[PDB]
Amino acid sequence: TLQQQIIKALGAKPQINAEEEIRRSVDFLKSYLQTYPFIKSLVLGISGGQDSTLAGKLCQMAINELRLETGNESLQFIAVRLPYGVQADEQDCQDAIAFIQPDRVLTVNIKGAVLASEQALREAGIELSDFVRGNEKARERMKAQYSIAGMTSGVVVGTDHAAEAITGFFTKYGDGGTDINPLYRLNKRQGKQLLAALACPEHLYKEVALGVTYDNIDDYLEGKNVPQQVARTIENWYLKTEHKRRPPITVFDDFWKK
Numbered sequence: 001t002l003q004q005q006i007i008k009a010l011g012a013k014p015q016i017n018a019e020e021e022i023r024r025s026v027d028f029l030k031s032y033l034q035t036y037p038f039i040k041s042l043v044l045g046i047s048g049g050q051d052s053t054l055a056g057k058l059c060q061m062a063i064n065e066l067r068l069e070t071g072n073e074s075l076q077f078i079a080v081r082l083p084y085g086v087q088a089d090e091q092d093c094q095d096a097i098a099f100i101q102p103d104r105v106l107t108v109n110i111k112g113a114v115l116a117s118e119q120a121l122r123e124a125g126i127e128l129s130d131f132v133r134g135n136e137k138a139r140e141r142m143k144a145q146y147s148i149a150g151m152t153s154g155v156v157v158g159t160d161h162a163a164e165a166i167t168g169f170f171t172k173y174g175d176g177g178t179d180i181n182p183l184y185r186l187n188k189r190q191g192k193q194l195l196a197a198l199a200c201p202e203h204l205y206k207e208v209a210l211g212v213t214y215d216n217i218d219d220y221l222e223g224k225n226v227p228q229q230v231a232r233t234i235e236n237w238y239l240k241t242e243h244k245r246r247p248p249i250t251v252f253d254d255f256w257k258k
């Protein structure tokens with residue numbers, strides 16, 4: 001079925017072992033850094049939400065272990081706060097940082113650049129809708145992270161996972177523009193499972209457009225029987241957003257023809 005095909009493509013499982021998955025992601029990061037020794041830092045945007053808090057903890061753990069094993073003191077995990085003006089979630093971000101205990105935290109306010117980009121477009125004749133402005137913000141955050149990685153010999157870590165990939169609920173070349181994604185394969189509730197296992201403060205991890213809830217998505221990803229109308233909605237989103245999960249389309253591609 002289409003559901004079996006999607007589960008296979010995203011690598012999702014009905015049940016996972018929290019500690020085992022924590023080690024799979026950490027060993028993955030450690031292995032990559034040992035294979036490309038010119039990489040000295042992992043860069044990740046921290047929003048105070050579930051996904052970036054989980055990815056951040058895993059990144060710091062990977063760096064911590066690598067430092068102790070190789071003795072290389074130049075390795076570092078860089079957490080990047082990217083508020084748009086004054087974020088109404090700062091306290092949560094502060095708690096997220098206290099939980100992660102990152103080596104370094106850089107704060108870059110993207111409001112100035114976003115307003116500048118909008119002024120240039122406005123003068124040319126293009127006014128943005130709130131939705132498009134949202135994607136613009138996501139792309140500015142990508143830019144900041146890549147500039148930081150470029151100056152610190154690092155790579156950009158993404159928070160993409162099965163529950164987001166299945167619906168393509170990310171900005172193309174925005175938060176979807178990353179180098180390595182250690183959470184890919186996990187669904188939403190499973191991400192909470194890993195955070196619980198890491199003793200993450202409960203308040204740190206506990207809509208329309210996707211006429212389905214995250215529980216509907218997680219159940220689908222776990223291979224459960226869901227209402228047919230729900231399955232159709234999820235599958236519609238999946239089919240509609242294949243372009244976001246593949247490189248730019250060329251004359252050789254045919255997936256869009258079926």
Ligand SMILES: Nc1ncnc2c1ncn2[C@@H]1O[C@H](COP(=O)(O)O)[C@@H](O)[C@H]1O
Nearest residue numbers: 045046047051052080081082083159175
């Ligand atoms: N306020 C923010 N500060 C830093 N990074 C952010 C922020 N908002 C978005 N991100 C990053 O983008 C990812 C997508 O989350 P979101 O678009 O906020 O639901 C997060 O996992 C973060 O890595």
Ligand SMILES: Nc1ncnc2c1ncn2[C@@H]1O[C@H](COP(=O)(O)O)[C@@H](O)[C@H]1O
Nearest residue numbers: 036146147149150151154155156179180
């Ligand atoms: N071996 C690698 N694996 C994954 N990402 C990397 C690697 N080498 C470089 N990058 C990323 O790609 C960027 C270089 O691409 P560019 O900006 O087009 O020069 C660096 O700033 C890193 O974020």
Ligand SMILES: [Mg+2]
Nearest residue numbers: 051052159164
């Ligand atoms: Mg997210």
